[PDB]
Protein: RV0948C/MT0975
Amino acid sequence: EIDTLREEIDRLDAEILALVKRRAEVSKAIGKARMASGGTRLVHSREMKVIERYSELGPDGKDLAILLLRLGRGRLG
Amino acid sequence: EIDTLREEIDRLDAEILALVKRRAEVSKAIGKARMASGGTRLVHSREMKVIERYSELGPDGKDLAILLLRLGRGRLG
Structure:
């Protein structure tokens, strides 16, 4: 039943949200530590590897990786 | 240590990828069932609610929701 499938989507979104929040926190901590050290951003190596990993899902996986990296980089209040 | 934080990112990405794959499968199944019934797409209600849920993360959360919905909708081979 389609509505039963939708209930599961909502449960999956709970798990995903929990993980994405944790990931964003870890990402932000890396960003701060890096900037505190004057460390070089790892765009061509590590970030590219994150993108490649999610590429498994096709082109939309690349966009997902990009968004997860973005969540790590801060926004203004 | 920053590199230890990076190791955790990679572990979080494993969990997230597993979940996103499952979500995409459930989403695709909904899409098919809906189109098999001539069912109306729930953009204004349900999809908006998914977007609102991820909005917790700020504007980038809205984009994350959009991408997860997109993963459900198919691409060509």
